[PDB]
Amino acid sequence: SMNPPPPETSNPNKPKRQTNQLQYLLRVVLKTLWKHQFAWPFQQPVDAVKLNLPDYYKIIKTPMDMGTIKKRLENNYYWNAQECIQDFNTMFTNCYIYNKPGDDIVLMAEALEKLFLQKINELPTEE
Numbered sequence: 151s152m153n154p155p156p157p158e159t160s161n162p163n164k165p166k167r168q169t170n171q172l173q174y175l176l177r178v179v180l181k182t183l184w185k186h187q188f189a190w191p192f193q194q195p196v197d198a199v200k201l202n203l204p205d206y207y208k209i210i211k212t213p214m215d216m217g218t219i220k221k222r223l224e225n226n227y228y229w230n231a232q233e234c235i236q237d238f239n240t241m242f243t244n245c246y247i248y249n250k251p252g253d254d255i256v257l258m259a260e261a262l263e264k265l266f267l268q269k270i271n272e273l274p275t276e277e
């Protein structure tokens with residue numbers, strides 16, 4: 151029932167890049183999802199204490215959220231776009247794993263994921 155530490159957003163010994171694809175993931179993908187009317191449950195780690203979800207971190211062992219992704223992008227945490235795309239996919243998948251089909255949170259994830267897929271469909275060619 152307690153919260154775990156959040157995912158890492160800083161690691162000075164992890165090698166970093168700022169590729170044109172990563173810039174797109176920030177300027178296009180994250181900004182589009184962040185401003186969406188359904189973004190708010192995804193803008194920070196799930197607070198299992200405040201939300202009374204004592205089993206959330208029993209079931210979800212790879213937590214991820216847009217607040218974390220935003221920090222990772224703004225602090226140039228990633229080497230490549232695939233790492234960040236995997237973070238978005240982890241976020242969506244966690245929601246579908248934990249919750250029931252048709253729950254409000256699942257509908258919200260599905261709306262965000264539809265936009266995510268549209269934006270990643272036009273991920274620019276590297277350099």
Ligand SMILES: Cn1cc(-c2cccc(N3CCCC3=O)c2)c2ccccc2c1=O
Pocket residue numbers: 190191192194195196197198200201203244245248249255
């Ligand atoms: C991804 N996610 C998110 C929420 C969820 C909804 C609303 C609000 C917040 N907030 C606000 C600040 C801290 C916080 O946790 C999380 C949620 C709630 C119930 C069941 C499942 C989920 C879920 O799967």
